[PDB]
Amino acid sequence: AEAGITGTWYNQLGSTFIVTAGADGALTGTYESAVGNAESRYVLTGRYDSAPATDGSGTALGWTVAWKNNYRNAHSATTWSGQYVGGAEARINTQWLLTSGTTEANAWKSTLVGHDTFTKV
Amino acid sequence: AEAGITGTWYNQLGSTFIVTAGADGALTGTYESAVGNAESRYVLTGRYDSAPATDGSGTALGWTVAWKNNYRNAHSATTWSGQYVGGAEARINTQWLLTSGTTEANAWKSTLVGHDTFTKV
């Protein structure tokens, strides 16, 4: 955990995030939806629950990205919920929720669900 | 359960379904997305798990509606997952998943999530 989480992570589709896990449960960094460009870059913030593990459990964590920066304002936010598992092939497995700001007529269609796995390679 | 489930159910927004709970776990009927019109009417099918209850548990169930009939073909299907609770104020509390058929580029945005409660009144 902590030192294990700190670094660069990649998913299947070309997205990258960079995170520092801080001593008292903090997670901070940047999500880049495409590894090339300097603003597909958005702020991330989250938390993780550190614990003594004796049985090969994952570490529960979560983070939020709001989709606004100097180039784009998509009127939406995503949360990822999941766990870190370390080792030779460390991964973070997540499920996510994306909500867009709607009028109240459209509120029932505001939230998408999906899943993502991140690796160090 | 069974006799308890059989009948007409209403949600907050004006939708209605009519269901028969059959002796060996079957659920069949029609969902009408608006109580007025004779085809906002679509076929439903599902299952429920009947059990001896001694502690005031709900009955787990689920059903599917594909959104095609003689008037509309929306290229989508919804599944509702939840439980029936009986009594003076019997309700069915659900969460749902709506998936639309997409091209593979659009597959990550294919599924919405939400929730519904149904009552007899």
Binding site: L13, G14, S15, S33, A34, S40, Y42, W67, R72, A74, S76, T78, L98 | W108, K109
Partner: peptide, 6 residues
Amino acid sequence: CHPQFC
């Protein structure tokens, strides 16, 4: 072309 993937 949402922010998340593009």
